[PDB]
Amino acid sequence: YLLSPETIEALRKPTFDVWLWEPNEMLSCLEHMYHDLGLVRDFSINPVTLRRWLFCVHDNYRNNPFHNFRHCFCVAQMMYSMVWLCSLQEKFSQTDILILMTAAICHDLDHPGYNNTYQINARTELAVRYNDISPLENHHCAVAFQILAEPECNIFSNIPPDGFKQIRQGMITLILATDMARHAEIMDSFKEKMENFDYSNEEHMTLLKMILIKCCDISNEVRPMEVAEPWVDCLLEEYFMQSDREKSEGLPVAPFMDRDKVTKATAQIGFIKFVLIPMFETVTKLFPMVEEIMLQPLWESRDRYEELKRIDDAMKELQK
Amino acid sequence: YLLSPETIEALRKPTFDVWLWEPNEMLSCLEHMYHDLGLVRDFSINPVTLRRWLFCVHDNYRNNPFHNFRHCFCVAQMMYSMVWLCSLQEKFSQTDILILMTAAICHDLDHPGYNNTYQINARTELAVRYNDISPLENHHCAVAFQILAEPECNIFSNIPPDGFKQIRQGMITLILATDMARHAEIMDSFKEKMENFDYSNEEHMTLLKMILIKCCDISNEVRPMEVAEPWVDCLLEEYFMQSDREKSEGLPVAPFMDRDKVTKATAQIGFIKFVLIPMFETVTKLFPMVEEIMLQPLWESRDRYEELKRIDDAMKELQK
Ligand SMILES: C[C@@H](Cc1nc(=O)c2cnn(-c3ccccc3Cl)c2[nH]1)C(F)(F)F
Ligand SMILES: C[C@@H](Cc1nc(=O)c2cnn(-c3ccccc3Cl)c2[nH]1)C(F)(F)F
Ligand SMILES: [Mg+2]
Ligand SMILES: [Mg+2]
Ligand SMILES: [Zn+2]
Ligand SMILES: [Zn+2]
């Protein structure tokens, strides 16, 4: 739990290998980030509270194949990478940086392993509790502030009330923004503002922060093929658990979750080409350095999966 | 326990004296409304479940001076009056009517007597659960469907799932629409659609139903003076209870809830001229009969409060 200076240097890049570490180790990396970004400094975060809070946050993540503490670490680490790559401290206030990192760490708190569609279709407590309005994201966010409501885990204890309101409002906006059901909507608002972006316009900045946490949340394919690939299997593993249960309970099943229809290759080709690449393209208009560091590996991921599908076709064709 | 034909007859007019009845008589009036509007008939509502349900609903309303079961009966009874006054059954499907009546009855379920501003500023469990997004309305709605989730109270048990979904979505929209913080937004949207209203445009109808339930929710002043006045004192009783708690907790207090600034007269004059009259005025442009049966008493109510203000100001000079 004493990060070597080599690790501290690789922790700033999207190439970081998130699979090599264990909870304890990742917990230290996260702790490092808060000190390194000077958040501990500028918000008078009690360095000890920060430690408890991170274990507080860790305990509240479930052992799902995909939506687990490691996913949370990936998102926070990718966010951390982007703060350096795009020199976000020259554009954002320390408050926004805090919002971005805290939102990233807490965005999937207590995820059950079944998406909103299952919650809504099965009429779960979450769905009824949140009236079908992004039940999961709402829950994550609620769990996050319940944690910050425990004095022992309140890393925000030394922030004036005016600041807390601005931080809370910001985190809520960003966590709720990760519901993919809003992807098209958010992307449009953003592409619009982009026609004439203005870092002084508060709405532009909010959309930008919304886009940033969205990129980090689904940025797995931006990492090296060795690091990125296993995440797809973790996600499908979780999805199949849902589809089986849905089939069992007689609830509708989404095609991309049906073993007999989804193939890693075909799935990732469309995800990369129509969701990932386009989103990061919009961001590269503000941060050109992104094209080389994040779009590049995304183009390689796309091509790799396209070639990987030709192999699947030729192979299945060969069997019939 | 039974209703007289005179009562049943009067139940159709906004002049109905809602104070003359006890829970069991109100439950019976509500019951009659469902049979009379053809909702029991068109949705195969088990007549026994209808009564059980009305009871589950009653049991879940709290004994607040204002936000209690009688208030919910006021809203439902006014909605009922409007269905007749504006001949709503010629413009609305029976599903729309069901949504309107059931939403009006369930719109304030389990209200605590302290509004959203208190919830948010005091960081209560509700404001945390719903991330400061219309926490109360979200809660009322969830209780309504928790109630409907108990087979014995489920008046929708014989409605196919597609219908339930459409009714659920409709009820959620209407209940969340009662949060006055959204009053300006909704009125603007509606007035925009009013530039060329279209009864066949779905977005047009959703807004009209939102306006309708909002009209019923804050319509106390449309009723005869003797029936309306006591509600104002009831609301204020609840409001002072909040501002008292707010001052002795360090939380800000709403000027209109401030014992030292709010006078029944001044408050109602404003509420009547800048909220009520304007809202019913734009509604009248769609339903002409509304001007005489509802806009008229509101004008009277306004004039009476303006006179009461002069008297009030005089006596308060002396109390000094
Ligand atoms: C593998 C899925 C598509 C997909 N690919 C990703 O890399 C990725 C990363 N996150 N993420 C995701 C996770 C949870 C919810 C929504 C999304 Cl979008 C992803 N979804 C499937 F099966 F092909 F649809
Ligand atoms: C007396 C209040 C104004 C007011 N007058 C009403 O007749 C009325 C009816 N409902 N309603 C109301 C009730 C709950 C929440 C919001 C409103 Cl708007 C009302 N608020 C006060 F003190 F002047 F602000
Ligand atoms: Mg999520
Ligand atoms: Mg209410
Ligand atoms: Zn996530
Ligand atoms: Zn109400």
Which tokens belong to A89?
A: 């401290």
The active-site residue, picked from B58, B67, B111, B139, is B67
Our answer on whether the CB atom of A74 is closer than 6 Å to any ligand 1 atom is no
- A66-94 burial by CB neighbour count: b if 16+ within 10 A, else e? bbbbbbbbbbbbbbbbbbebbebeeebee
Residue A68 labelled as part of a binding site: yes
Determine the residue type at A248.
S
Of A24, A86, A107, the closest CA to residue A287 belongs to A86
- How many angstroms separate the Cα of A251 from the Cα of each of A197, A247, B120, B165, B289? 44, 6, 37, 14, 48
How many C-beta atoms lie closer than 10 Å to residue B304's C-beta? 17
In one-letter notation, the amino acid at residue B299 is: W
CATH number at residue A103: 1.10.1300.10
Q: CA of A134 to nearest chain B CA: how many angstroms apart?
A: 11
- Integer-rounded Cα radius of gyration of chain B: 20
Angle in degrees, CA B55, B59, B63, rounded to 5: 135
Question: Of B210, B97, B100, B173, nearest to A131 (Cα)?
Answer: B173
Q: Which of A139, A119, A128, A122 is nearest to A60 (CA)?
A: A139
Contact A250/B at CB under 8 A:
no
Residue A94 marked ligand-binding: no
In the annotation, is A58 catalytic?
no
Task: Tell me which residue range forms the domain holding A5.
Answer: 1-320
Question: Do the chains contact at A149 and B176, CB–CB below 8 Å?
Answer: no
Residue from B12, B175, B3, B157 nearest B82 by CA: B12
Which of A123, A131, A134, A137 should one mutate to test binding to chain B, selecting the residue with the greatest count of B CBs within 10 A?
A131
- Give the integer Cα–Cα distance in Å for A220 and A231: 7
Ligand 1 pocket member A82 (CB < 6 A): no
Closest listed ligand to the CA of A181: 1
Q: What is the rounded distance in angstroms from the CA atom of residue B50 to the CA atom of residue B71?
A: 20
Q: Establish if A142 touches chain B: CB-CB under 8 angstroms.
A: yes
Please tell me if residue A123 touches chain B, with a CB cutoff of 8 Å. yes
* CA dist list (Å): B264 to A247, B68, B171, B233, B267: 60, 21, 32, 8, 5
The two three-digit tokens of residue A116, written as one number: 């909103």
Chain B CB within 8 Å of residue A63 CB: no
Please give the number of the atom of ligand 1 that sits closest to the Cα of A275: 18
Q: Which of A236, A202, A193, A222 is nearest to A280 (CA)?
A: A222
Q: Are A222 and A78 in contact (CB under 8 A)?
A: yes
**Cβ-proximal residues to B9 (8 Å cutoff; 6+ apart), any chain:** none
List the one residue out of A247, A130, A142, A223 whose CA is nearest residue A181: A130
The tokens for A233 are 């299997």
Integer angstrom CA distances of residue B116 from A239, B79, B124 = 38, 24, 10
SS (H, E, C) chain A: CCCCHHHHHHCCCCCCCCCCCCHHHHHHHHHHHHHHCCHHHHCCCCHHHHHHHHHHHHHCCCCCCCCCHHHHHHHHHHHHHHHHHCCHHHCCCHHHHHHHHHHHHHCCCCCCCCCHHHHHHCCCHHHHHCCCCCHHHHHHHHHHHHHCCCHHHCCCCCCCHHHHHHHHHHHHHHHHCCCHHHHHHHHHHHHHHHCCCCCCCHHHHHHHHHHHHHHHHCCHHHCCHHHHHHHHHHHHHHHHHHHHHHHHHCCCCCHHHCCCCCCHHHHHHHHHHHHHHHHHHHHHCCCCHHHHHHHHHHHHHHHHHHHHHHHHHHHHHHHC
**Helical packing angle, B161-176 and B202-217, nearest 10°:** 50
Tell me, yes or no, if A146 comes closer than 8 A to chain B by beta carbon. yes
| Residue B222 Cα distances to B74, B216, B272, B296, B298, angstroms | 11, 10, 10, 8, 5
> Under DSSP, is residue B201 helix (H, G, I), strand (E, B) or coil?
coil
CB pairs A-B closer than 8 Å: 39
Cα(B317)–Cα(B300) distance, integer angstroms: 26
Overall number of domains in chain A: 1
Out of A58, A67, A140, A204, the active site residue is A67
As a whole number of angstroms, the distance between CA B101 and CA B42 comes to 14
Which value, to the nearest 10 degrees, does the dihedral of the CA atoms of residues B298, B300, B301, B302 take? 90
Return the ligand number nearest the Cα of A139.
Answer: 3
Chain A residues whose CB is inside 8 A of the B141 CB are 131
A129 neighbourhood in chain B, CB within 8 Å:
129, 142
How many whole angstroms from A89 Cα to the centroid of ligand 1? 30
* Closest listed residue to residue A36, CA positions, set A62, A9, A4: A9
- C-alpha distance from residue B85 to each of A203, A287, B77 (Å): 44, 60, 12
Q: If you measure CA to CA, which chain A residue comes closest to B123?
A: A149
Measure CA A245 to chain center: 25
Cβ(B283)–Cβ(B225) under 8 Å?
no
Cβ distance B172 to A131 less than 8 Å, yes or no, reads yes
HEC secondary structure over A218-283 = CCHHHCCHHHHHHHHHHHHHHHHHHHHHHHHHCCCCCHHHCCCCCCHHHHHHHHHHHHHHHHHHHH
Task: Give the contacts of B310 (CB within 8 A, at least 6 positions apart).
Answer: none
Q: Does B172 touch chain A (CB under 8 A)?
A: yes
Using the structure block, give the residue that is written with the tokens 């404001």. B127
Name residue, tokens 């009969």. B289
CB B11 within 8 A of CB B80: yes
For chain A, the residue count is: 320
What H or E segment, with its residue span, contains residue B120? helix B116-121
Looking at the CA of residue B266, tell me the nearest atom of ligand 2: 23
In whole angstroms, how far apart are CA B117 and each of A61, B122, B215, B246? Answer: 31, 8, 22, 10
Rg value, chain A, Cα: 20
Distance A82 CA to ligand 3 centre (A): 20
Burial class (CB in 10 A: 0-12, 13-18, 19+), A60: buried
How big is the CA angle at A157 (ends A156 and A163), to the nearest 5 degrees?
60
Element (H, E) at B310: helix B296-318
Assigned token pair, B269: 């004059």
Q: Which residues contact B123 (CB under 8 A, 6 or more apart)?
A: A149
Is A67 among the annotated ligand-binding positions? yes
Q: Is the CB of A305 under 6 A from ligand 1?
A: no
For the record, the structure tokens of B82 come out as 């409007």
To probe the interface with A, which of B109, B123, B131 has the most A CB atoms within 10 Å? Answer: B131
Q: A218 CB under 6 A from ligand 1?
A: yes
CA geometry: angle A29, A32, A38, nearest 5 deg:
150
Length of chain B counted residue by residue: 320
For residue A298, the ligand closest to its alpha carbon is 1
- Look up residue B265 and give its two tokens: 């007269």
- Give the SS3 label for residue B212: helix
CA atoms of B141 and B109, how far apart (whole Å)? 7
Q: Is A138 on the interface with B (CB under 8 A)?
A: yes
3-state secondary structure of B221: helix
Tell me the binding residues of B.
67-71, 107-108, 217, 239, 267-268
Closest listed residue to residue B276, CA positions, set B183, B197, B147, B203 = B183
A71 labelled binding-site residue:
yes
Closest among A305, A127, A138, A128 to A228, alpha carbons compared:
A305
C-beta atoms surrounding B116 within 10 Å = 21
- In the block, residue with structure tokens 């954002």: A92
* Pairwise CA distance, residues A52 & A213, whole Å: 24
Distance CA B173, CA B137 (A): 10
Resolution (Å) of this entry: 2.5
Cβ partners under 8 Å of residue B133, min gap 6? A172
- Tokens 């960003």 -> residue: A174
Nearest to B265 by CA among B297, B319, B309, B302: B309
Tokens of A206: 């909010």
For A151-171, letters b (16+ CB in 10 Å) and e give: eebbbbeebeeeeeebbbebb
Q: How far apart are CA A106 and CA B139, in angstroms?
A: 24
Residue contact A149–B123, C-beta within 8 A: yes
Contacts of B110 in chain A (CB under 8 A): none
Going by CA atoms, what residue is nearest to atom 15 of ligand 1? A180
Distance CA A217, CA A34 (A): 19
A18 vs A15, A55, A228, B312, CA distance in Å? 9, 18, 10, 71
Best CA proximity match to A76, nearest among A57, A92, A95: A57
A19, A42, B80, B146, B151 from B101: Cα distances, Å: 55, 53, 7, 18, 20
Method: X-ray
